[PDB]
Symmetry: C4
Subunit: 480 residues, 4 copies
């Protein structure tokens, strides 16, 4: 027993007591190391914070990261009614229902989705403002995020013709496993914000339920536990990869890694591009209407060598942003590198991964390192021809984060299957048209790289000249 | 969708007189306002995102002219010789599937009549999937002098093709264009949106198995000159040369087959030097199409080497609002822009269109800009013009 | 006497009789050679066309270009009331007065004009649709016309600092005359459309009335005669230059040239860039709601040599569009060349004259021709820094056509003086700031030419990606 | 213009709490909604057309980063040494004439208090045309530790200047910035529009006669370190080096003096190699300003060689809506973007910002595009997204 007004006593920034599902916790040393930032816990401190908590955390977390002697005994009965926190939906009004009228069956039938951009549109409408902000933002005014997609558009194709492209096969192998498709679902934190009942379990299900099965990378900061997500996988032939942030308390990482090896995950993607979390202003603005110990900021190349000794899964460094570190990764002998800038949510004038890919692969060949490092690419990928562009430049496989978060959010596991289908078909269709019948035949010679560097900022222009100019017009109908 | 009231009132006597149609885009604006959705999506589409479809046109805007002045230009001559025959103008009507969608009554018979009713006889390429029989169409042609060509998909039941070839040859068509850029229907989502896995796009009519050997054999089975339609890289121009065909139409289907496919004019610019260095240029006729909507686009195309240039959609939507007379006028319009521009470049014969009339120095300034800085812009206010007195 | 219904008899395309100020004319052989195109005369043929005629033609024209035996005797009395043509204002409704309410004193006081773009704005509002169309159009969808101005914007500056720029002097000399300013008014056909009472006489007056006097180039197709325009010039120190189209009947040119030498004009600009008139669709569209003998299309370099023999004024070829013809002009030994594309009203993908200027001047130096040809530039020039850019590249002097047509149209002679003032001041002001004190010191080394060639056409982009993307927003006021 | 009701209601208690100001543009959006027209035109202007004014900022967008990963970055340090003194952060407040237009009550005294009230002490450059006396301002400074500099126009009555120098030196200012890019007030038509021939722009305060010799003499007449403010080409950097001054602020006044003046970052990128090749780099401090509105712009500037970067307008409009506290927060905001970015580039000291952290390969892709093809575009319709069911 712990008398509830004695609990509430400690409603302070520093020496914060809070109630989650009956038990009481001291969230004082904890507060500043919280993943999203201490803010949320501060504002709602000294209350029963259970509605904020439950629909949003991997069940395992308190037991896994809070000190045991901070897990304080139970709250006597309950909390005085305005102290049980209503669910977190900042900025949302009674809106929750117009977005649900929108959702309720007004969502077009899944057969009518023609592409990955339809899920986005549908998801910007029916998703909650916290979830839209969180899923869609980029760091800091967002030029690396949009850049990630536009850079694909600086590459055209050189199609071969009168080649018999009757059967086309797009399977490939990634990290020593034969995979059905050359792309994967990249780790995404908090999928229960968009798909509250199932979250990551439904992406596990859509990736392995159909005839095309796709690799799933699970996030260290996922709303579900890995053991739930791997259980929910419907096919023994589907693949799962685990993404790791290494903690300032290295034993916590140590136990996380031995636990996901045993659970069956096939590779470790260590995310190195986020020492400090990136400023995402669309979320910040909503919370009005960077270091912490969870992601240790002192991780160094010596830590990945010691991490190899502790594990038998191939290690992939996720977040490399220049050729110098792709070579460094090849020298410490790790299994592959994901050239990624974290969806343009971290350092904001970072380059487009396809542009770094282009720069790198000629160097790995000059240095005869090309066959000893698998290079993946993500960010910005939205059409099967964007996947073909990265694969012709020699990316081993391509990842997507947001397209799967919005298919899963709007249509759960069948949205994720429908997106896998949409893109498998775009790749295959665009491979006939490009004259090739297998991933192995996708080579740089099918691309025009000549204006890969046309990244222009135009001179500001001329509001008066253009305000007065008047363009030619079309023929007017006699009436209209 | 009940719009048929609006549309039948839009064409019927609200369409401006043919004499008020200044340019090939006017036809497109009026066709876009009157055709049935199903027709507009089929005619105006592109392969998903349509960036090669817009790029096709816009690469013309990367090429600037280098006009000669004080050159006598009272008399200019735009006739040329494409594929043995000698045609009136340097451009043609390209094959547009199912013309009866816009022109229910006469379909592609009306394009035939427009290509030969007036003064100028413009070549017509007949689609294997025409919604009128080759017979109907050839037979509709107004002149012994208008020349007609056949584009052919080769069918998987090859004897269908062998019948079809030998019968069109009977009907006196003057050449064969084997379209080869479509082993699979590109996703034209505009249609889809209104309307087998990645195989709905595969078809029985068009055979996915086609290969240079099939063209080699098709040479040896016909007398007509054969032109591969759909080449998209220099290597295939040089192969169409080594297997001995007549022409190559540098094309990508109107940006409705692969979507980051280069602009044909950008590929011409590069292939033609190679044909000169490999001495095989005089062998091959190289046609170009996609995006030509103005006389000056036609001329950049001829200055670079193209023997003749084709046009799909302008003719298709001229036909759809004004039938053969519309087709006839679009021919006049483009003939006058080509005449007027030559006289403004200081040239008089199509043979005089060479490259040195062209500023090609920014042909590769195909650029994607870096993302607009939304907030700098949201707070920035520009200058303002003067204001009239209110009173 | 010629009985008026006998007149009207011949109301036909071909065998067109028409009445202008009482006398009758046979405008049959004439019709197809008319400058604007036979259309206007056809439509209104066989009537009393005097209101179309009088407010729009140089008084001298009938007597000067019509065959004398085509000048038929007088119309008996008059024309049946609907056959006296109301004034040409195609597309104009009763509109003539809202544009005059606009004009009537609602036109801002001339002291409030800050720049050349204000006259344009004011002129697009109060000008008549025929005159707006005619003044503002370019040939054929208009990329060379807008290009002419934007190309200036591909050149930046390299200012010198801590230079004593107390007194700055901007006079220069052009075609052997010392001129107050480095720019001139370029020939413009029909100025009475915009300034009906005075037309070109008011530009003659504004160029020479003030303390800064500017060269006036008079047009062979001007609403006023040269003898009226030279009489109206208020200063004996102002300069006038004559622009010539040579006719298919070379004696007509022959007499035009000897007449303007005697009238006092100081140079002959022969316009060679218009064998055929350019398609200007904004006018064509209004006339619904190319060769002719007036401008001989067979003019050849041999005709400019024979024209030199006949004249003592310096000859300037106006309309050169490549370096090869600038050298040809230097070889036939003519006095200068105006690199111009006729305001982007003739061949429409022609280059920007500043860009050809840049290309040419290094060649005239390699070929030691630079001091023996004066090169002028026009088209697109709107700010004094655009004039400085052409002068640092070595243009001898810069011309403007539309800025003077819209100052004269809105404010007559004082608009033309105010524009001369506006630009004299922009040049002078921007010459202090650029560290130089005379035109002779304007040299290429003050410019950055490194992105002179950045003429880009971007890849079409991505309507779906951008339709769904949502940008970061600014802080909302508590209310607004 | 009676708006004063609207504006006094706009600031008074509709301005968001300082704690809700995410970035330096927020200040600009709120100042643009509340200042008097006369103030907004004076603060936010540019020399006619304002293309260098927008270009100043946008050239930052031509430079991309090359981050290092797996570099220990728990502890990063952004203090640097500008002009003998050792400052907290690598950036300063630049001289903004007449701060009392936005901040009537305290003018530039409030910027002094904002630059030293909080934790970080940011340098302040005082305008010779400040609307508060040097005395007032210096005296308002909260710390022995905040450093203050004086920018000086030299007056035509040079003894006024000689008095002014010797008295500011008395008041302990730590250096002199002689602004030299303004022998004549650029035409800021925004002001003009609301408000001698090409000589209204000439003034008595600023002397048009200034010349390197005057700087040479001014060296020999003061002890403070002198920085020429307004250099715009490498040659003048190298001359400021040969006449022995402390720094050069690569500047063009905020794009309100010559209007096609290059972007300072574009000129830094070019001058710094030259200073290395001519061995005189360690001699000169090179500051940069114009357009910096984000921490990453500051860092591109430091990676290229700049010793410190200044900012006019952000501080001026932070001061105008929130006075010294606004000035204090804009300092915090930029300090956190600079810290956060270094930790994301894998660097820890300002000395570690070198150039190899920069993708400078498209620094000269300052491009003007060719004219938008109005009609192709007017008739072109793009794809469309899916639609919710209506019911
Ligand atoms: C008992 C200690 C806590 C731990 C160990 C913890 C841990 C985490 C972790 C690891 C994440 C992201 C992934 C996941 O959910 O597993 C997260 C996110 C978050 N936590 Fe906690 N949390 C704790 C307490 C709380 C409390 C008491 C609240 C309520 C104020 C809360 C609210 C949130 C929210 C709302 C986010 C999402 C951030 C965003 O809005 O973008 N957490 N937490
Ligand atoms: C008597 C024989 C005629 C001659 C020699 C002649 C000559 C010219 C010339 C040289 C110009 C341009 C410069 C100038 O006005 O001097 C012009 C323009 C024009 N003329 Fe005539 N003209 C003749 C008869 C007519 C008649 C009968 C009409 C009435 C239908 C007419 C209507 C016009 C119009 C409206 C234009 C301006 C074109 C435009 O709208 O852009 N002209 N004419
Ligand atoms: C909501 C969201 C959360 C993400 N969370 C993680 C994460 O938990 N761990 C990680 O290593 N990367 C994360 N990513 C980024 C990567 O998986 C990946 O680089 C990706 O999202 C690339 O961007 P795309 O969305 O443009 O494909 C996240 C991205 C988004 C959009
Ligand atoms: C409605 C439509 C149908 C087409 N059908 C065919 C066809 O039957 N066979 C073929 O070879 N090309 C077909 N094309 C494309 C070519 O004739 C040609 O590439 C042409 O459309 C060029 O593009 P443009 O219309 O932009 O000039 C078709 C094009 C359109 C727009
Ligand atoms: C209404 C108008 C009429 C023109 N008439 C002539 C003309 O009579 N003769 C000539 O040689 N050039 C003529 N010009 C063009 C040239 O004087 C000149 O190249 C010029 O107008 C350049 O364009 P700007 O208006 O951009 O300065 C005309 C241009 C306009 C806009
Ligand atoms: C309102 C305003 C007034 C200015 N007054 C001066 C001044 O008194 N003296 C000076 O050297 N610079 C002056 N500047 C410009 C510089 O301090 C500096 O170049 C700065 O404005 C840089 O541009 P930014 O504000 O875009 O960073 C002023 C700038 C502004 C915007
Ligand atoms: O990985 C990311 O992109 C995240 O956003 C990290 C995170 C996870 C959960 C809450 C806030 C931030
Ligand atoms: O060749 C084309 O581009 C066509 O669109 C062919 C076609 C015709 C009719 C239905 C489907 C495809
Ligand atoms: O010189 C031009 O630009 C003209 O427009 C020629 C002209 C003159 C008078 C009427 C029509 C065309
Ligand atoms: O230096 C500047 O940029 C200024 O604007 C100086 C100034 C101050 C007050 C009135 C006019 C000019």
């Amino acid at each position: 027993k712990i008398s509830p007004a004695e609990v509430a006593k400690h409603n302070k920034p520093d020496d914060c007591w809070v109630v989650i599902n009956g038990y009481v916790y001291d969230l004082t040393r904890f507060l500043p190391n919280h993943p999203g930032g201490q803010d949320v816990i501060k504002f709602n401190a000294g209350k029963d914070v259970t509605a904020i908590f439950e629909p949003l955390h991997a069940p395992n977390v308190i037991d896994k990261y809070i000190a045991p002697e901070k897990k304080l005994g139970p709250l006597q009965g309950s909390m005085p009614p305005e102290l049980v926190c209503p669910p977190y939906a900042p900025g949302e009004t009674k809106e929750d229902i117009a977005r649900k009228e929108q959702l309720k069956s007004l969502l077009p039938p899944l057969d009518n989705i023609i592409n990955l951009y339809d899920f986005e549109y549908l998801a910007s409408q029916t998703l909650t403002k916290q979830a839209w902000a969180f899923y869609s933002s980029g760091a800091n005014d967002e030029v690396t995020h949009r850049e990630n997609h536009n850079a694909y558009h600086r590459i055209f194709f050189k199609p071969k013709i009168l080649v018999d492209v009757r059967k086309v096969d797009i399977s490939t192998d990634m990290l020593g496993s034969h995979v059905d498709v050359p792309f994967y679902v990249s780790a995404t934190a908090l999928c229960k914000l968009g798909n509250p009942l199932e979250g990551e379990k439904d992406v596990a299900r859509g990736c392995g339920q159909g005839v095309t099965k796709v690799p799933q990378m699970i996030s260290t900061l996922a709303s579900c536990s890995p053991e739930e997500i791997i259980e929910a996988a419907p096919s023994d032939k589907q693949i799962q990869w685990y993404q790791l942030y290494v903690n300032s308390d290295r034993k916590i990482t140590d136990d996380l890694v031995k636990n996901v090896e045993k659970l069956g995950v096939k590779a470790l993607f260590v995310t190195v591009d986020a020492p400090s979390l990136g400023q995402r202003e669309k979320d910040m603005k909503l919370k009005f209407s960077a270091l912490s110990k969870f992601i240790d900021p002192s991780l160094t190349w010596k830590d990945i060598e010691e991490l190899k000794k502790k594990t038998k899964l191939p290690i992939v460094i996720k977040g490399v942003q220049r050729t110098e570190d792709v070579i460094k990764a090849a020298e410490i002998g790790v299994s592959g590198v994901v050239l990624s800038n974290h969806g343009g949510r971290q350092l904001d004038f970072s380059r487009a991964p396809i542009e770094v890919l282009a720069e790198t692969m000629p160097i790995l060949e000059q240095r005869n390192l090309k066959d000893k490092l698998e290079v993946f690419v993500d960010g910005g990928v939205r059409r099967g021809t964007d996947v073909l562009k990265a694969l012709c430049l020699g990316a081993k496989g391509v990842g997507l984060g947001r397209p799967f978060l919005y298919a899963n959010s709007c249509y759960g596991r069948n949205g994720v299957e429908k997106a896998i289908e949409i893109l498998r078909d775009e790749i295959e269709m665009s491979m006939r048209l490009l004259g090739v019948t297998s991933i192995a035949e996708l080579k740089p010679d099918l691309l025009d790289l000549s204006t890969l560097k046309a990244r222009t900022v135009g001179v500001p222009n001329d509001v008066l000249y253009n305000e007065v100019y008047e363009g030619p017009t079309l023929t007017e109908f006699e009436d209209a």
